[PDB]
């Protein structure tokens, strides 16, 4: 089972603060058990994932996560190294980072967080071989993002 810690102070994340809605999906259950996000490169949820990102994240991270007043999220560099893994990315969104990048549990359901995460992974512009959050099959069909 994955270890879910606040990326800043290392304290255990408290899922008791999570919204009761959207904590039951197969995606969330699978994720909390394996640390694997089944929504990655899932054609069926990407359309909604894009909308979630657009309304909640684009203002600071850019239309294509290329960065704006906030840091880019579309290449292999991460201020917080753990974000190269979905367990880490999830932890960042749930527990928050610093400054205006605070916890998202008050606005997003656990399922929505996973869907938003999937869009961030889809915006990756790096080499597919470097996308360790993708399975072999997913890597085969992945193409670095381009506007």
């Amino acid at each position: 089972a994955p270890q879910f810690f606040n990326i800043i102070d290392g304290s255990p994340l408290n899922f008791d603060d999570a919204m009761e809605e959207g904590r039951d999906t197969e995606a969330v259950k699978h994720f909390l058990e394996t640390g694997e996000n089944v929504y990655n490169e899932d054609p069926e949820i990407l359309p909604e994932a894009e909308e979630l990102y657009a309304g909640m994240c684009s203002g600071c991270h850019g239309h294509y996560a290329e960065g704006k007043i906030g840091p880019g999220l579309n290449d292999a560099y991460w201020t917080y190294p753990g974000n190269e893994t979905d367990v880490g990315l999830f932890s960042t969104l749930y527990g928050g980072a610093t400054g205006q990048m605070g916890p998202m549990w008050g606005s997003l359901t656990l399922d929505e967080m996973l869907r938003t995460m999937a869009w961030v992974r889809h915006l990756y512009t790096g080499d597919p071989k470097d996308a360790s959050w993708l399975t072999d099959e997913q890597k085969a069909g992945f193409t670095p993002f381009q506007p």
């Binding site: 290329e66 960065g67 906030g70 290449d75 292999a76 560099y77 610093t98």
Partner: protein
């Protein structure tokens, strides 16, 4: 005139004050392209890759003369304290295609 230089030479990133305004440089880009800060703030650039980089403001931006910042090696930092409100564009000397912007308010 519109900015002061805390340190003429780059320093170890470890010396960067915690919770300081930082712009990371990696994968041939300034990770935060349009940084917004307030008058008086000190911005710190930190190179995160082997490829050397620097910040360069053409003449007439921060003063009468251009400001060719020193080249930073991996894990080195360089700071600039803006004292005047305004938008300041900059680029990387050897890599003209690398551009960034600091908006002081």
């Amino acid at each position: 005139d519109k900015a002061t230089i805390p340190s003429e030479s780059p320093f170890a990133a470890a010396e960067v004050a915690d919770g300081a305004i930082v712009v990371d440089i990696a994968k041939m880009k300034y990770e935060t392209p349009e940084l917004h800060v307030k008058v008086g703030d000190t911005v710190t650039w930190i190179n995160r890759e082997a490829m050397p980089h620097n910040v360069h403001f053409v003449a007439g931006v921060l003063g009468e003369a251009a400001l060719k910042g020193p080249m930073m090696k991996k894990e080195q930092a360089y700071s600039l304290t803006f004292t005047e409100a305004g938008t300041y564009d900059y680029h990387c000397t050897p890599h003209p295609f690398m551009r960034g912007k600091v908006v002081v308010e």
